[model samples]
Target: AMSDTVIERHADTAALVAAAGDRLVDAISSAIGERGQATIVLTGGGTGIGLLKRVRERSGEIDWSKVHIYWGDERFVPQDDDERNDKQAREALLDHIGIPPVNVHAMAASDGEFGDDLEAAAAGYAQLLSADFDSSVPGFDVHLLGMGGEGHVNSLFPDTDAVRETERLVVGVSDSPKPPPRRITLTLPAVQNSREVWLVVSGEAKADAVAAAVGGADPVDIPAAGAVGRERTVWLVDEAAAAKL
Candidate 1:
């Protein structure tokens, strides 16, 4: 609860992703060394996918077998769809690593087992996670998030019911402000159940929201503000994104 909130600005997206990639590997390795296993929550977007690509290049540094992967949130589309965060992650990093297929926990796809029932899909993902950790919520080792310029994180848009939720770890979004209306996202509680929550953002478009969230704006108005970690929370942003700070 007393997690340290650290902010680091980089010269550009490249530098930010580079430094974040190093910390990511170290975080996973440290967790595995001390706890025998490490769980990570992956996200999508420019810097998010960029960070994964960086890790894919340095995949040998960490013990992939002991690392488990999850998504901070995912677009509710076909599993093979390019819009899915898990799909992009597989292409960017997971497929290149030695992690077990069973350890990669992807949220259910709309065209897969659940069909059009978003609630069932969301519940299924939560149930699988609960079974995997044998707990209501697992403290992820490294949770990466990509912030939207409108102040959303993990599909939890500003003023949405998803952001107001406190108990559920996962929920279905049928009216997402963004296109492809359906989505599955981890709640604020779920995001906070992490050892490190890293907001990897870039570009000048996100500067205002970055400044607002960092200024302690209400999570309801700036959902990214609610993305806290139990051990530490980090804002890894490019200079352009940190402009307003």
Candidate 2:
């Protein structure tokens, strides 16, 4: 319900990731200082993964062991598959960090216990979050999102079935407009269930989406417009992505 928010637009993807890292570190440090631990819901994509890489490269005394990681969505592939969000995150950040293995919670691979049952997978991840926190709103301390040029956040594409989500907090899709077909994603309600949400995007291709999200346009037409958090919401972009504004 934030009427205004903070947005930092950089020059390119590299700058976007760097700034994201700095902001992440700042937020993590603040959260840990105030509460002893922090929960972060992560998103997977080029810019999102790039931000993780930056954090991996310069993770100074931030008590990473006290941090818990969660994925906002995942491609329903094998756990170790190259396309899995967990794998990409591991290669970029987790593998190089000292965070406790018990703290990392990734979506169950399609071949894992969840199998091809996406609803079960959704319930599994929901239980994962519910185990530590309350089931109602404010389920996460921070949530990171990546915006597709076509105006999608997580796997919720505009005008797609996923955008109509309401009842289920998390669900899996089999007809994603952006390839790989199957993916498990948090619904808009789930995305907004966080205390803070950050959208990291870059390029001129995304300028319109970012502008629409912040320009009071319809959220249903531009999925990015629906992004929110209980306390604060942010759109972190690059100069190119902000060009249209």
Candidate 3:
């Protein structure tokens, strides 16, 4: 594990999802107790969606209505597209929960009001965050993420200019190495503003990247390393993903 990170391992992916689900609920409940509401940035992937399903199954005592939902990254597809992060999240958890529709801050799609102008969409989301936080970007109670095989977090790929960003809270990503080629993602600085950041990952394909990130790899070389929480950073890995460590 990275010297500065807190690592929590599970026997397999299912166990990791279960643990993450419980933790998410606890964190949200704790934040709500102190602030009367909780804000979280969600991620997308099998592991992320699994955790959401578990949360929906076991979210006892959580007042879902007071929760504010956001995404760490989203594909620039139509709102109903299956590949859209927000859609998957809603299908897995948000739809089953009681969160207010106005509290759901989904990133704009290619056909949204911005209409194919991804840069404008990115700026609009930033403005939304600024208004909500009354600052540059709100300090989320928790920012959850999924690690890509290349050590990327959100759409911030290794060696890309997006990984080097420090000023903007969010940015438009074009020519992404991954599929769809276009996306909107939170900058590392914006992710780091959260009270806590959770990197939830699984699979042997991600083992090397996880190890390198925790081993203090350069953020430009291993973008996941740059995603740190303001107060705490945690890495929740399944056995396969933790093999290298």
Candidate 4:
């Protein structure tokens, strides 16, 4: 583990998901208690949804209404598509919780009002974020991230222009190495504006990426390496993902 980052390793994916869910709730609860509301940036994929499931199972006393949710990235597909991060999040947790519909701020889909215009979609999300937090650089209470095997966080892939972005709060990505080719992602600046950032990952496929990120690799080489929170940064990895570390 790196001296500057908190590394949490779990025996299995199940344990990791449970612990992450607990930490998520704890952070949101603390944020709500301090500011009357909590803003969270959510992630996608199996581990992310798993943690959401665990959170839902124990969400009884939490004030879900006071919490706002946003996505770290979106596939730029239809909102109803199974590949949509927002859809997966809703199915896993939001739908089962008491969070107000207005609080769930998902990125615009390709078929949305923006109509396949990724740039407009990105701009809309940036505007919405600014309107909510009243700042161009809105800082989230907690930002949850999932790293790709190629060391990407959100749609900011290795050696890409998005990874070098230091001005825009969000950007549209085209020709992504991953499927669907198009997506919207929060820029590194926006990601770093969070109070806390938690990288929750699993699987041996991600081992090297995790190791390189925590090993001080350049952000341009590994976008995940740049996803640091303003106050805290933590990597919660399962045994397989932490194997190289």
Question: TM-score for each prediction?
Answer: 0.95, 0.94, 0.95, 0.95
Structure candidate 2, residue pairs in collision: none
- Per-residue lDDT of candidate 2, residues 98-152 (tens digit): 8999989888888999678977887888777666557434578889999887788
Error of 4 at 152 (Å): 0.4
lDDT of each: 0.87, 0.83, 0.89, 0.89
| lDDT for position 5 in model 2 | 68
Judged by whole-model lDDT over C-alpha atoms, candidate 1 comes out at: 0.87
Pairs clashing in candidate 1? none
Q: Mind giving the per-residue lDDT tens digits that candidate 3 earns over 1-245?
A: 33257899999988999999999988999998988889999999898888999889876579988888899999998988899999999888888877789989999999898999999999999888777666424479899999999999999999888999989889999889889999999999888888789999999999999999888789999999888877778999998999999
Question: What TM-score, to 2 decimals, does candidate 2 have?
Answer: 0.94
lDDT string for model 4 (88-158, tens) is 99888998998888989999999998998999999999888777656423479889999989889999998
**How many residue pairs clash per model?**
0, 0, 1, 0
- Model 2 off-target regions past 4 Å? 1-3, 132-137
- The RMSD of every model to the true structure, in order and in angstroms, is 1.5, 1.7, 2.1, 2.1
